[PDB]
Amino acid sequence: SDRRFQLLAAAERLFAERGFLAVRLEDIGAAAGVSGPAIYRHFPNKESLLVELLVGVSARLLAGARDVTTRSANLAAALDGLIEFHLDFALGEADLIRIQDRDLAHLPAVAERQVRKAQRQYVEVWVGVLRELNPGLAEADARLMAHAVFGLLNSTPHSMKAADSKPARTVRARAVLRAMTVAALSAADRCL
Amino acid sequence: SDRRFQLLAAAERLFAERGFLAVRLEDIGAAAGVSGPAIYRHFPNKESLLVELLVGVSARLLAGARDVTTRSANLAAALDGLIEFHLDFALGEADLIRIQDRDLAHLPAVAERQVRKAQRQYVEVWVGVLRELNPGLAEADARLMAHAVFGLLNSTPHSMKAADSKPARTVRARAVLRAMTVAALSAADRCL
DNA sequence: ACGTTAATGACGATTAACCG
DNA sequence: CGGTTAATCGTCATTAACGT
């Protein structure tokens, strides 16, 4: 199915730009070629597109984070790897980031709990690394630091709608956001 | 007495929690203690509630930022004041932050341009202070740093839904997020 | 003013009725 | 299999039509 992939990619782009509710199934159909309710030959309803997109990305993030900590010999290398991983993600899959923290509530209850579980576990991987690096760090403080870092890195979605970010933009942004993130986590640590 | 204010405060809470489109006038009426499309005796349509909320907050933020830079003797004091101001906003008016960067697209075109103007000008205030502190800093890098800081500070809206909001939580979060922000901006600066 | 309860009218997700 | 186009059917914002 290259129509199945074409619909999901159209849905991803349109949900990011316009939001879930304001996107008309016919618009997704149209953008993929064929449309109105051709969609139902691939999917059983709107919601199922959103579910595939968000269950997919939330599972990928958790698996990728675990892979990073698995391969890392030491906790400093693990943190560096998690930053790199999430930075690649934030720069590369901005649309799925924007959908995940704008449209989570529009999931069927079952799917919503599955995505919240994968997200909670992704935060816990970061919290686990930060607390092992600083045994004096309270759970609550580690969580706050983690969310703050995701916010810092996910600030290209908020400064990038459909802009350049090919040449010096990609490499420059990566350098600056990594430096900001590394310094942020060091200062949090020396206050706490 | 304050029926207009009661509707806006209900609309602010519900738009933040459920998003603009999924909120029914009747839900806002209900919560304000005034069933139904009574709303039309105060406002000419849904959209006008969203417009008042977002034109209001975007104008406030710009005015507040200008006030901070006006009163500050030195650029270090100005940056500290802008951080404090935005931190107070992020901790205190989380609902309006969430609505502004989730539901901007659902404004009438005129209102959307007014809010984007006030947002652009608010970013420019931060950019002005950062470039005067570091004349070697390019415009593009200052903007990236500004957006990164807003992202970092607006990470309590994403970790806090009507939670606490208590003594130690407010003051603790403020301390930690300020330390992260100050360190982030110092490290960005010494890379650039 | 303000509010209440019935229309009205769109719009948009499913679904039915028909082809390869 | 996928697709099509013309019904349904619910759900709202918005208006009417009536009291305050």
Side-chain angles (χ1 to χ4, degrees), chain A residues 40-137:
Chain A
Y40 288 110
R41 297 274 156 232
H42 294 250
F43 294 87
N45 47 51
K46 247 233 272 268
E47 262 188 2
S48 75
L49 282 157
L50 185 66
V51 164
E52 185 137 337
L53 287 177
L54 293 191
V55 172
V57 71
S58 63
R60 250 205 301 297
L61 277 168
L62 178 53
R66 281 179 175 155
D67 159 74
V68 167
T69 59
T70 291
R71 296 163 161 293
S72 301
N74 62 99
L75 311 190
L79 182 54
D80 284 328
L82 283 179
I83 292 166
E84 299 308 326
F85 174 63
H86 192 281
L87 201 34
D88 285 342
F89 200 78
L91 281 156
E93 283 196 312
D95 284 344
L96 282 169
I97 285 151
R98 180 165 185 70
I99 294 164
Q100 177 141 107
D101 75 58
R102 167 177 198 183
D103 285 325
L104 189 66
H106 300 133
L107 288 172
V110 166
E112 174 160 343
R113 257 186 306 298
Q114 194 179 350
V115 171
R116 285 190 188 293
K117 186 153 184 147
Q119 277 177 1
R120 165 172 24 271
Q121 288 174 321
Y122 180 75
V123 174
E124 289 331 322
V125 169
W126 280 77
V127 167
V129 166
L130 292 171
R131 294 195 71 196
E132 284 184 333
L133 273 179
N134 186 1
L137 215 68

Side-chain angles (χ1 to χ4, degrees), chain B residues 37-120:
Chain B
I39 289 80
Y40 285 109
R41 294 287 170 217
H42 297 254
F43 293 87
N45 48 51
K46 246 231 276 218
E47 259 186 6
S48 75
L49 281 153
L50 185 65
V51 165
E52 185 138 336
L53 288 178
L54 294 192
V55 172
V57 71
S58 64
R60 248 205 299 301
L61 279 168
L62 177 54
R66 281 178 174 155
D67 163 73
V68 167
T69 59
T70 291
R71 294 166 163 292
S72 300
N74 61 99
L75 301 191
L79 182 53
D80 281 327
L82 283 179
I83 292 166
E84 295 309 322
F85 176 64
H86 191 280
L87 205 31
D88 286 345
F89 229 85
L91 288 161
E93 287 189 309
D95 284 343
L96 283 168
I97 284 153
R98 179 167 185 189
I99 294 165
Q100 174 141 109
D101 74 59
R102 165 176 195 176
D103 283 325
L104 190 66
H106 300 131
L107 288 171
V110 165
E112 177 163 332
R113 256 187 304 299
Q114 192 176 354
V115 171
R116 285 189 193 295
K117 186 181 195 94
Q119 277 178 7
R120 165 173 23 272

Side-chain angles (χ1 to χ4, degrees), chain B residues 3 34-35 38 41-42:
Chain B
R3 206 33 90 70
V34 52
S35 340
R41 294 287 170 217
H42 297 254

